[PDB]
């Protein structure tokens, strides 16, 4: 009994009121629900972003997903003094989101549209990819640098 939720979204571990070195007391929450926080009363939904790219993608769109990707990566390397031209980050976001969904750089993500069984096997999971390609009678052309 003394563990149940009566008030608030049951997605937020905790909320914490912050100050941006001014008289503005913004609050950032340690949760996994962005639409609920966006629609909560007294919160401006126009300016309300989460650092979770996949949460941005499912709520706002693939374009907002690539914006979130670019801002997150840039900020991440801006807190370590890594001066990278933003065009590289823009290209990373564009290659991550140009399929209409946020595709990772993980092995599962690489199987996006490449169809290059040689490149996939060189990357990782050689035998299963090769055998699936041989079973499916895949006809991959030789176009990639790998």
């Amino acid at each position: 009994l003394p563990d149940v939720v009566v008030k608030g979204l049951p997605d937020i571990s905790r909320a914490v009121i912050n100050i941006r070195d001014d008289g503005k007391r913004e609050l950032l929450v340690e949760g996994y629900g962005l639409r609920d926080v966006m629609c909560t009363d007294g919160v401006i939904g126009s300016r309300t972003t989460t650092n979770h790219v996949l949460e941005v993608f499912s709520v706002l769109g693939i374009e907002a997903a690539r914006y979130s990707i670019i801002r997150e990566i840039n900020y991440t390397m801006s807190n370590h003094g890594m001066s990278v031209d933003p065009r590289h980050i823009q290209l990373l976001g564009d290659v991550m989101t140009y399929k209409g969904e946020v595709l990772g750089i993980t092995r599962f993500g690489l199987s996006k549209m490449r169809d290059s069984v040689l490149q996939l096997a060189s990357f990782e999971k050689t035998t299963d990819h090769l055998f699936d390609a041989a079973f499916y009678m895949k006809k991959d052309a030789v176009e990639g640098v790998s």
Binding site: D85, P86, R87, H88, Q90, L91, L92, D94, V95, M96, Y98, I105, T106, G109, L110, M113, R114, S116, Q119, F123, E143, G144, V145, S146
Partner: protein, 49 residues
Amino acid sequence: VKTAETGYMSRRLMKSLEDLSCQYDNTVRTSANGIVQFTYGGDGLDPLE
């Protein structure tokens, strides 16, 4: 720990952008001739320059 952990990250990033090259019509395309960017960085400008 960072050595190997970061080593794969760089290789993985390359594997994804291995065949992305600026074309002669000023578009960034995959090896499948599919468009990723209609103009590099929305500018067409080389960061090296």
